[PDB]
Amino acid sequence: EWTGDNTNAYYSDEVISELHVGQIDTSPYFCIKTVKANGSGTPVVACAVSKQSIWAPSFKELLDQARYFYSTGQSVRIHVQKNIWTYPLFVNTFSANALVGLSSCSATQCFGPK
Amino acid sequence: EWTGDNTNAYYSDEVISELHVGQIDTSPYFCIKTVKANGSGTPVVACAVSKQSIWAPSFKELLDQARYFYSTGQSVRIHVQKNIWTYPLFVNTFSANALVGLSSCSATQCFGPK
Amino acid sequence: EWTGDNTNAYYSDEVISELHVGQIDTSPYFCIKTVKANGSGTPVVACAVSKQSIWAPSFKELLDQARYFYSTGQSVRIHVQKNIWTYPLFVNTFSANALVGLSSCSATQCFGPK
Amino acid sequence: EWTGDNTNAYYSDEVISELHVGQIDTSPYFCIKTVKANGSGTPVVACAVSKQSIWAPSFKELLDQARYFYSTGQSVRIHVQKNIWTYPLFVNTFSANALVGLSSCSATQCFGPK
Amino acid sequence: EWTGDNTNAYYSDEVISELHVGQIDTSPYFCIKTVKANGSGTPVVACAVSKQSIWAPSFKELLDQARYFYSTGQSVRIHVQKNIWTYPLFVNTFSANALVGLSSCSATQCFGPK
Ligand SMILES: CC(=O)N[C@@H]1[C@@H](O)[C@H](O[C@@H]2O[C@H](CO)[C@H](O)[C@H](O[C@]3(C(=O)O)C[C@H](O)[C@@H](NC(C)=O)[C@H]([C@H](O)[C@H](O)COC(C)=O)O3)[C@H]2O)[C@@H](CO)O[C@H]1O
Ligand SMILES: CC(=O)N[C@@H]1[C@@H](O)[C@H](O[C@@H]2O[C@H](CO)[C@H](O)[C@H](O[C@]3(C(=O)O)C[C@H](O)[C@@H](NC(C)=O)[C@H]([C@H](O)[C@H](O)COC(C)=O)O3)[C@H]2O)[C@@H](CO)O[C@H]1O
Ligand SMILES: CC(=O)N[C@@H]1[C@@H](O)[C@H](O[C@@H]2O[C@H](CO)[C@H](O)[C@H](O[C@]3(C(=O)O)C[C@H](O)[C@@H](NC(C)=O)[C@H]([C@H](O)[C@H](O)COC(C)=O)O3)[C@H]2O)[C@@H](CO)O[C@H]1O
Ligand SMILES: CC(=O)N[C@@H]1[C@@H](O)[C@H](O[C@@H]2O[C@H](CO)[C@H](O)[C@H](O[C@]3(C(=O)O)C[C@H](O)[C@@H](NC(C)=O)[C@H]([C@H](O)[C@H](O)COC(C)=O)O3)[C@H]2O)[C@@H](CO)O[C@H]1O
Ligand SMILES: CC(=O)N[C@@H]1[C@@H](O)[C@H](O[C@@H]2O[C@H](CO)[C@H](O)[C@H](O[C@]3(C(=O)O)C[C@H](O)[C@@H](NC(C)=O)[C@H]([C@H](O)[C@H](O)COC(C)=O)O3)[C@H]2O)[C@@H](CO)O[C@H]1O
DSSP states (O other), X not given: OBTTOTTSEEEEEEEEEEEEEEEETTEEEXXXXXXXXXSXXXXXXXXXXXXXSTTGGGHHHHHHHHHHHHHHTXXXXXXXXXXXXOXXXXXXXXXXXXXXXXEEBOSSOBSXXX | OBTTXXXXXXXXXXXXXXXXXXXXXXXXXXXXXXXXXXXXXXXXEEEEETTSSTTGGGXXXXXXXXXXXXXXXXXXXXXXXXXXXXXXXXXXHSOSOEEEEXXXXXXXXXXXXX | OBTTOTTSEEEEEEEEEEEEEEEETTEEEEEEEEEESSSOXXXXXXXXXXXXXXXXXXXXXXXXXXXXXXXXXXXXXEEEESSOOOOHHHHHHSOSOEEEEEEEBOXXXXXXXX | OBTTOTTSEEEEEEEXXXXXXXXXXXXXXXXXXXXXXXXXXOOEEEEEETTOSTTGGXXXXXHHHHHHHHHHTOOEEEEEESSOOOOHHHHHHSOSOEEEEEEEOOSSSOSSOO | OBTTOTTSEEXXXXXXXXXXXXXXXXXXXXXXXXXXXXXXXXXXXXXXXXXXXXXXXXXXXXXXXXXXXHHHTOOEEEEEESSOOOOHHHHHXXXXXXXXXXXXXXXXXXXXXX
């Protein structure tokens, strides 16, 4: 598997606006919120939980890269795979998206799979 | 278990104002204090111990997040599980609360379980 | 093997312009895009992939160093080994270049092999 | 054992003046120096040594926390256990104080065992 | 062995001018160049190789301490042991000096072995 599989969803020109970290089922997890840098669209919520999903190996690098991007506030493309999380109250608070990639976006192009 | 369980407590629009690191019983641990962004209400102290309680496997993420929210001074929702730590002079100095989550807060809302 | 083997290629006076982090084939990975400080020449793309290639041991060090040199926008020499990644989609989204070294530069020389 | 044990000694309103990193008999170590924020008293020196003494599990948590309080220069409470390091030249260079905790100090009381 | 053995060599009031990360013989390594803050004297180049020499255990501590001092630009004392590294293409580019510790320096004194 790869972040750039067309079986994943991505969203260009996003700013990570909120950040949460917590625990579920003996696993640490974090979620981010992103909103469009130009005020449009609707927000995207994605999580990563450290020992679940096929994306578990990525957890610490994702979290670290989320934390960095969140602090600079730059334009980023956000990559997810839908319909991964299953605890109903959890997906209610956040969503069922699994974070799978982050790409910095210039004003013209983004630096990730497309 | 889950950070967002209803058996836990949360306190919104807090800002982390104190941070302390030590060791207890061969265990790294940290403690934070939080005060209302407006300065009213009663402070919240919560603690994480790296080898103890169901919440140990998230020790370092929570430390890393508590540190980041500590430096920015931003307003956050802090989540605890009360009546966890039992060494009475530890508890007297700090709390019986286990830290189990940290969410960023917008002025709108906070990005965490309710 | 060594970063400064003549079987490797390097590009001085570059600026890490873009950063992407993702997961491929159970490995967390990152790529960078470096531009000549002025606008000259063609960009170079280079990836490091946890647990993959002979350069795997250096993954975390090159990821932290890249994060730094990218936060500063300072001049660097970037060292690569060509034709390492073989997945044609990944190679077309990025490059086959394995990142193998990163050097700061002053106004005259860069601090690394050449 | 605990940072807060009355058999341990501590110092309020310190600022981490210096920071040093080295190795001694197999172990990475670091030493800090603190002086009172008002100029009073005499400097405190404290060291932590990896894989050595009962405080060894805290080495990296304590180093990260020492680095951070160093970078900010904020007022802190340093907790130590005295007479731990015996290496005569090392102690004459720094001290035999083993670093057992770090506490933030704000307008009101220092956040830690008192 | 100890950073401050008089069989080692040190230079005070230096600034970390350049940083390089790379890999050699399956081992991440890094090197630094230091110049007198007053401009006097000749640079010192020192390196740490994560798998080799008796200073291996402190590889990561020194890496983290070098990166911090390099980012503040503050004056330091660098300690090295001469004539450690043997591979001539490596020593010709950098040095045979192994990095063995780092101290922060006042305008009057350095906090470390003399
Ligand atoms: C000139 C003009 O008027 N352009 C606007 C645009 O606002 C908008 O185009 C956006 O910018 C780029 C190209 O113009 C990108 O292609 C965007 O396309 C994607 C993206 O984010 O990269 C493609 C991606 O596959 C889509 N993701 C999914 C799951 O379908 C997303 C997504 O559809 C949007 O970002 C919306 O996301 C949310 C949650 O709101 O877009 C593109 O957004 C263009 C859109 O058609 O409308 C023009 O008017
Ligand atoms: C197409 C199809 O329907 N195939 C079916 C599956 O629907 C079916 O579903 C799985 O059954 C398992 C047996 O209980 C599990 O319950 C699966 O859900 C869990 C899991 O254990 O893996 C339940 C668990 O509570 C979840 N944890 C959290 C924090 O939410 C996990 C977790 O969500 C996932 O591990 C991570 O996300 C994913 C999707 O990877 O999901 C359940 O899906 C299964 C047999 O019952 O196989 C086919 O028969
Ligand atoms: C009077 C008495 O000891 N009764 C106990 C039961 O309570 C006991 O479960 C224990 O509760 C104790 C206090 O009532 C201690 O918490 C026990 O051990 C420690 C531990 O080391 O694990 C002691 C230690 O002081 C505690 N650390 C701190 C910072 O307070 C820890 C820590 O609190 C643990 O995480 C427990 O907290 C929770 C809710 O998980 O507990 C603890 O075992 C039971 C078996 O011990 O039967 C009686 O002996
Ligand atoms: C005699 C005197 O000091 N008079 C006043 C004091 O009111 C006050 O002195 C210090 O004020 C601090 C509060 O900000 C602390 O209360 C000091 O108590 C401690 C401390 O640092 O917490 C208590 C601690 O137990 C002591 N540690 C040890 C090993 O004994 C330390 C220590 O004695 C001092 O920090 C000095 O140590 C060194 C190396 O310098 O003190 C309290 O003493 C302060 C208010 O203005 O100054 C005087 O005016
Ligand atoms: C006011 C002004 O313009 N300049 C002064 C200088 O006089 C001063 O020079 C330094 O003064 C220091 C404190 O007095 C030390 O004496 C320095 O000597 C050492 C050192 O770095 O610690 C002593 C040390 O033992 C020597 N190391 C070895 C292996 O011999 C080194 C070494 O010789 C030098 O660093 C030169 O090395 C190279 C390759 O360049 O010197 C002394 O340098 C100045 C700081 O340089 O700051 C002002 O106070």
